[PDB]
Design a protein around this ligand. Structure first.
Ligand SMILES: CC(C)c1cccc(C(=O)NCCCNC(C)(C)C)c1
Lengths: 119, 120
């Protein structure tokens, strides 16, 4: 089953997909998911993208202090001490981001919906 | 004066943690519109907002890491690097660095700051 797999799930209002993990399967096509910040709730399957990790060359939004819409492209993955890091390219330069800092806007997530969506 | 634009740690959900964020509006009725570092926006009661930027030294906090949601630690240092704040969290005699967005407070941990920094 999908229980225990890491994913990115849309978040109601802003429609952004945040890194999380499916903790239980429920009815009504919903899933109990736990976001990396500790918040747990039920979301619909159509709002979940089975991505661990976000694939290379995906356009994403990389979070940094006082930056909320900074777009970039995934160009690398790296495992270190049981933690995933993303190499994000922007304006010809690459920077390292931790997993939870990499999110997808509605448009960015829609591009993966067909292949990785649980709809 | 005006708390608009000031960074805070605020609890938006019932029985949730205090997360790093920013005040964006005074919406009256003892509420404030907040912008969490992850981009989520919502109104939050003043009593649920801790006006401290950064979190004071020697504060017990929770430091987030992949697959760890309850790791406790104490703040022992602050550092700015490329306009970003980093916390030095001490746990079991060793110190590790965490970005601002990764340092959160539990209800018990946040309660230790209400009297001094709470907007209630
Ligand atoms: C990347 C994300 C998982 C994250 C990491 C670190 C801190 C915060 C944060 O400030 N959470 C408060 C707003 C609610 N955020 C969710 C995810 C919609 C529940 C969020």
């Amino acid at each position: 089953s999908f229980v225990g797999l890491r994913v990115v799930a849309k978040w109601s209002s802003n429609g952004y997909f945040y890194s999380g993990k499916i903790t239980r399967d429920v009815g009504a096509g919903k899933y109990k998911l736990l976001f990396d910040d500790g918040y747990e709730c039920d979301v619909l399957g159509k709002d979940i993208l089975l991505c661990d990790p976000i694939p290379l060359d995906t356009e994403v939004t990389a979070l940094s202090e006082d930056e909320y819409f900074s777009a970039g492209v995934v160009k690398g993955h790296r495992k270190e001490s049981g933690e995933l890091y993303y190499s994000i390219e922007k304006e010809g330069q690459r920077k390292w981001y931790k997993r939870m800092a990499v999110i997808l806007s509605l448009e960015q997530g829609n591009r993966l919906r067909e292949q990785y969506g649980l709809g």
